[PDB]
Every structure is written in structure tokens, then in C-alpha cells.
Amino acid sequence: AQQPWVEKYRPKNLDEVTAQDHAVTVLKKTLKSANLPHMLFYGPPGTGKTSTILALTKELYGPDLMKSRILELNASDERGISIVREKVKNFARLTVSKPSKHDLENYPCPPYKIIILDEADSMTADAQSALRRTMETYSGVTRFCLICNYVTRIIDPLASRCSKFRFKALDASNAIDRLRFISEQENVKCDDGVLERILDISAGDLRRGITLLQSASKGAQYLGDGKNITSTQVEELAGVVPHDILIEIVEKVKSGDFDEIKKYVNTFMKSGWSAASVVNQLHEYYITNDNFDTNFKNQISWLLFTTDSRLNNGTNEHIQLLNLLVKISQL
């Protein structure tokens, strides 16, 4: 169609949701009954929380009753204490919509309406406290479904009431079938290890893997040579630092000479590499290597962890990378 492969290949029913077998099985067995509890979907980005909840919505009701028995609130609309106190409570107090005869024939419409709350971690503490008793009281007629990437932002009473379904990160073992299906359906030729490299580059981020595969396919179409994708092409598109530059970085680090390291870091920052990938590759090169003793790895794990934690909070990549390389050099 006229959509990106991420939106084009979004799962429709709960069967297409690769991996996440526990949550999908629980939801599919709950579909026959009407004992759907308050859910708390959480996990890394791209794992498939929104896809799962949309598939469950389509399966329970059907494309007719979705607009009438589903209320969703994202960060695109305000989610302060007042809106939760008024709009959410008003929707919860309302009686369920009237199913049509066709829906009663074909779909198992339950006697409740689902209130999806995407990015519930971005709510304030007061809004969640207001949501607690609304969730507990009118639960006979409505079901809440919080979706958030961080459980810690959610207060503990909501974590107590809401049944938690952790969404596992998708890797080369869990989501290889989905990428194989996408490649075979879109007629994309690739090597044996291309899809494994794609899933390894992403960290539980199958959407990013789909985008990388689509970009590689677009590049192959532009070249028009009819050649299978190689691992080097996907490596270069993904922003993955080539191994020769990493070897040069390690050689500079081992030799000390702070000024030389500083000049090479300035040139490296000119090259435009993202510091997160560089730190990840430094970890994968240093920890897995067998030329370093226990003390060196013990110190360098903490050094890399501190650099990663500091890079998570914004900051300038140049200074963080330079400091990391200086501390590793002094080891």
C-alpha cells in the first residue's frame, strides 16, 4: 500500500503478534470468557503493546463497536488531574453501548468498555491517585488498560490493581519469523545472516528492524542490480560504526598519550557517529575479549555504565566520549 512497512505490517488479530506468548495466550483465553482484568502493559519500545491492545479491541468488538466502546487517551491530549476527574469518570459511569444484531451474531461482545491510557507513566501522581478509586469502583462496567514503558513512574496502588503483562524484548530468536515473513511477502533478497544482524542491531525494537529492512530494500531498488543485501549495507544504514574505526579507537586508548586521544576524538565527533552505538561497541569489544584480566573488565564495566547513564540524560556526546576514553586509557 501507500504506507511504511511498519504501519502496513501491523498485526491485525492476536495471532500475528510474534513472541509475547504469555500475554497473547492469556488475552485469547480471556476472549472466550468475560473476566478481562485491568491490564498494565509494559516493556521496551517496539515490543508490541499498542499492536496487542488494538488487536484485542478488534477481536472483542469488531470495527463497528470500536468507536463506541473504546476510549483512548495519549499524551496528544492533556491528562492532568481535572480531565481524569471529569472525562474519565463520566465515560466510566456511562452504560455500555447497545450491540447490533450482526455484532451479536459474529463477535463475542463483552458487557464492558475498555479505557486505554497510552503513556500512563507521563501522568502526575495526583492524576493516578484520582484514577485509583474510579478504577476500583466502576470496574463492573468498564476496564482500564494502562500502557507505559516505565513501571516505576506508576504509583504502587495502580500497580497493585492492574494486572501486569511484561512485554519481552524481541531478539534474533523470538522475532526472526516475523522478519522472514515480511521479507518473503515484500520480495526482498538477503543473505542468510542479514536478518539476524538486523535483529541484533535493534534492542527489542522490531519496529526499528522493519525500518532498517525497508531502507535496505529501497536502496536495493534504487541500485536496481538485483543483488541480495549484504550485512555491510545494513550495518552502514543502521549507523553501526565500522570495526576498523573501533580497532583504531582501541589502539589509541591502549597507547595513552592523552593529546592524541583528544585529537582522534575530535575527528571522530566530526565523523558524526552517535555516542550510544560507540559505547555499545566498546562494551561488546572489551567485555567479550579474552586479552584482558578480571580487574580491567571490573573497572571498565562500571566506566561504560557510568558513561551510558550520563548519556541517557542528554548531555554533550563529545565530552562524555572523551572522558570515557580517557578513563579507559588510564586503566
Binding site: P4, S76, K218, G272, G314, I319
Partner: protein, 340 residues
Amino acid sequence: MSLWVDKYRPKSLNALSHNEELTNFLKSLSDQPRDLPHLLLYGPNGTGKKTRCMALLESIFGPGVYRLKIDVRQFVTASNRKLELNVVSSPYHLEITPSDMGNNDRIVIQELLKEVAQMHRYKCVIINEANSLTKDAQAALRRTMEKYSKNIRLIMVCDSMSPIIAPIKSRCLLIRCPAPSDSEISTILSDVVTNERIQLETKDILKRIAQASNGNLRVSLLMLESMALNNELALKSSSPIIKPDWIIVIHKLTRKIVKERSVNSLIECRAVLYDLLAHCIPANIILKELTFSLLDVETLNTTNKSSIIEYSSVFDERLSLGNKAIFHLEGFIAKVMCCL
């Protein structure tokens, strides 16, 4: 316009000969406009990311994308605080920047994307300086860009994309734009000087511009214009390198910190820092430049350099987690002078 940086600008992917692989990738994206994912161009500042974005837009939509119209819009915030931000609109796309107050940009980005989302088939949106968005604004932008895809597309421009949150980086196709090499800067400056009229005799001055710019095309062009008007359109092989006044005062502060370590020097440094912050330079770049000027002093020993870079990292984290932007720099300077 009288400036040579803006009117010497490529208008299409064919005119762009800076990077063959990046241009080939952009052409690959532009071959099929029907299936175009959301873009996010990242890299060092001043390499011409917006030039690539506009060239790609012309390669996709067609001509007229440079016919920018300055449309003004009104916004409603808490209490009586009214903010007026003008949107730099255009046919076939739209440009938006977080030029408003930093704490309240969520509502603006929210209602702009909601309004444009209503009405080839899609209308692109370019967000310049995207690393400056508050984390709540990006969280709001996430679902806004995910829900509407057939109608809106986002080409999100940012340098040093670390402050961008994880989901936004997940749903955005990432494109890397490396900085210009010395040869590329020299070639571009040679093209400019050949098209214009400057009495130039040695190629060494152009390479000195390339070295002094640190891979910054815009700064190199501004330097060329400045000392071209200064030298009466006749560059000299021994022409002194002109630097921005901010660089000069940062270097002066560095020499002051190095040569003397006293509390009176500290209060003078406080006055200078307040002046620089009032001169509208972001505190992150001030700290980076001060740290990189301190490390370039040959008098300092290696242990002092390591301590300086460690404290610089710590106070950069504090600056990213702060709102005063002067307390952290003062603390960093105090720690540096204590180390020295």
C-alpha cells in the same frame, strides 16, 4: 542577500556533490514517495542538514518548496501569558521550530500537528533544532506522529540527538550526516571565490579557513565573508585568523583561570560568565568550549587534564539536569581552579 552563505545554497540533490553515499541514499528515498518513513537527520552542526532536507523535499514534492511564507499564529497558555510564534509555512510542507519559551512548547507543537494533520498526498513537517524539545513535548509528539501517517510525515532535524527520547528514535528512520572534510570545505570555498571576485594568490588561506572552521561550512563562509570585506577583497597569505568575540572572551577566561587561582579571579570569572550568558550562548556549548580550551593549554599536566575532563562531564550532566545554567558553570570553574 548580501551574505554569501545563504544565496550560495544548492537547490536540488544533483547540485549536492558533498557526499555521494548520502546523496544516493536520499535519491533512493525519493524514488518512491508513496512509502516514505519518518526521517531524523542527525550529525554535527552546520554541515547542511537543512539543505539536504530541502533538496529531498524538492526531489519528492517538486518545485516551489522554497516559496516560504511567514504566517503568524496565536496561542493560549496558562493565566494571561500569551505567546506569539510565527510558523514558516510553505506549499507542500511546513516548518516549525521551538523558538517559543522552553517550558511551554507542548501545546504549540500539539495543535500545529493536529491542525495540519486534518488537511504528494501527505504534507511534510520539518522540526528544526529538535534536540531542544522538552521531554514531555516529545512524548506528546510520539502518538501524534504514530496515529496520523497517511496525512503527515515528519522530517526531524537535530544535532547531538542524545536528548531525544527512545520511542522517538525508535519510530524515526535515522540518517547520519558527517561533517565536511578539509578537501570539501576547500573545494566549496574555491567555488565561492571563483564565482565572486577576491584577489587570492595562494590556496593555503582556504585550507587555513577549513582548519579554523572545524568542519563548519556556515562558520567557514562567515569567516570568508568577514575577512574578505576586511581585506578589501584581496586575501593575503599571512592574513590573521578572525574569531568570534565569544571565542575570544572564552579564551581570555581560560588564560585568566590558568595564570591565576584566586577568589578575586573567581568573582571576575563570575562577572564574565554572567555577561556571556546574557549574550545568548547556550551553557552547554560554553562549558564544552571552556573545557576544550583548558585542555589545550600545554602548561597543564595530564592528571589535571583528566580531573578537568571528569568534572566537565559531571557538570555537563548537571547542566542537562539544571535550569539556572550559571551555578553549574561557576561550580565547574571553582572545581577546576581547586584542581589547578
